[PDB]
C-alpha cells in the first residue's frame, strides 16, 4: 500500500458557531504543515517510527493543541504530561506519565523505548532517567498559555 | 491529546500519542494516552491506532487494541472495526472521542463520535486532507 | 506479584492483582500488575484474568485482554487461548511468567512457562488443589 | 459452578519440604477462605479483594508485607481490581505508605473519575477517604533483603 500519515489534535465539542473562518484557518494551517512534514519524510524513505515521533513533537510545540506547549492546567494551576510511542515491527513501546520538567514527552517516551528494558516510567524518576541521557530540565511555566488559563477560570469558582 | 499514525515504504506501522489531560484535573491521575492498547497501539500484522477522548472509558474498552483484535482475529475491515468501537462500544460505556488508524494495506480511518476532531492525513506525494467538523 | 480471579453464584467475574515489582528494579518503573488488559482484566461476557511475569512483555502483548479477544473474536477455548499467549506469544517477545483465568462457563486455567508458579484453585463446596512446580 | 483461582507469583522456584509446606499451607488457607465466601453467596468482587488482601498480608508473597526491594533498597507497590459486572476498574502505582494496595485500588474504582492514580497523589486520595498511613519499613523481610544481595 501507499505510504501514508494521519494526525489528530483532539476530539470534543468543536462548533461552527464558535469560530470565524480566519480562526479555523489557524488550526487548518497548523495541521497542514505537520502532515506535509510527515508526507515529505515518508516520500524520502524515512521510518514510520521516526515520522510519528516528529509529527507528535510538532503537535506538542504547537500552542493550539493540548500536549507540550499549550497543555491544559491542573487543579493546582500546574501542568502534568503523558505520552506513548509503539513500533509495529519490533512491538517495542515506551511511555512516560506525570512529567512536568520535560519539554517534549514523546521524545522521553522514545528514549524509554530505545534506551531501557522498560515500557513505562512515572514522575520525577522518569525525568531523572531522561536528564541522565542529556535531555534538558525545563520549568513547567513554559507550557502555559492565556487561552488555557481562561478555560481553567471558566470551569471553576474563585476562592 | 494529540497523536500520529504512519505506514512507511518498507510496510512498517507506528503510533504515538501525547496529552496534558483535562482542564482542572487532580494531579497524579493517568488516562489512556500513555497506556499501550488504550491510547496507543501498533502491530505490522494489523493496524496503528492513536486515540483521543474520555480516558477512563478508552482504558476499560482497551479501544486501540480492540481495533487490532477485531481485524486480526475477527476479520473485520478497518472501516467495520472503527464503526464497531467508536460508534457503538464507546458510547454504550459513556465514552466520547475518536481515533486515527492505518492498517497494514494502507487503508486510513479517522472516526469520532463528537461534534469535531482536529485531524489531517495524506499519502506520500499527494495533497493533504484536513478537517475539524463532521 | 499475587492475584485472584472468581466466578460467583450470580455469574459475576472479577480479577485483582498486586505486587512489589522485580527485585533490584529501577524505581519509578511500572510493569503489568496495575495496568488494565496487561496484568488484570474482567468481563462477565468473557473471562477474568490475573498475570505474573516480565512486565514490559505482558504490557506489549496485552496478555490479560488478549485471552478475552482470542476467545470472543478468534473462536479459541480458554485452554487454547491460555496455551497460545503463555507458551508461544510471551516467549516470542522474551517474556517469562504465567496467569490464572476463569471463563463465564466456569472453565479454569493456570498456565505458566517458568519453573514454578505458586497457585491454588477450587470449586465452591469442594476440596482445593495447590501446586508450586510443573 | 462458583470457583476461585489464586497465584503468588511465577518464576525460577533448592527448598526443603518444610520450606515448601509453608507455601502450600498459605495457598490452601487463602483459597479455602475464598471458597467459603463463594459458597455463602458473597460477590466475585468481594472474594478477589479479600484473597489478594490475604496474599498481601502473607510475608511469603511479593505484595504488601514481603514486597521485594528496589535497586535503592526501597519498596514501590502497584495493584489493580476490575469488576466484570460493571466493567469498572481501579489501580494505584508506585505507592509506599498504604498497607494494602488492593484496598486503595478498590477506593479509586469506587470514588475516582479515573482508572489509575500514582505516587503521593494516590496516597493522599486514599488518606482523604479514611485509609491509614504506614511506613514502608513494615513491608521489609530478611528473606527478600538476602534475595536483593544475591541479585546484586
Ligand atoms: Cl507442586
Ligand atoms: Cl520433612
Ligand atoms: Na502543543
Ligand atoms: Na505479602
Numbering used by the authors:
A (entry chain AAA): 2 to 160
B (entry chain BBB), C (entry chain DDD): 179 to 312
D (entry chain CCC): 3 to 15, 19 to 157
Sentences from the paper on this structure:
l-Asparaginases hydrolyze l-asparagine to l-aspartic acid and ammonia. The same Thr179 acts as the nucleophile in the autoproteolytic maturation and in l-asparagine hydrolysis.
The D210A and S211A substitutions, located close to the threonine triad, despite the presence of two small nonpolar alanines, do not affect the conformation of the adjacent side chains but modify the pattern of hydrogen bonds to water molecules. The side chain of Glu234, rotated towards Arg238, has a slightly different conformation and a different pattern of hydrogen bonds in the two subunits. Moreover, a multi-step denaturation process was observed for most of them. Analysis of T m of the autoprocessing mutants reveled that they can be divided into two groups: those with decreased (RDM1-3, RDM1-8, RDM1-29 and RDM1-37) and increased (RDM1-12, RDM1-18, RDM1-24 and RDM1-38) T m values.
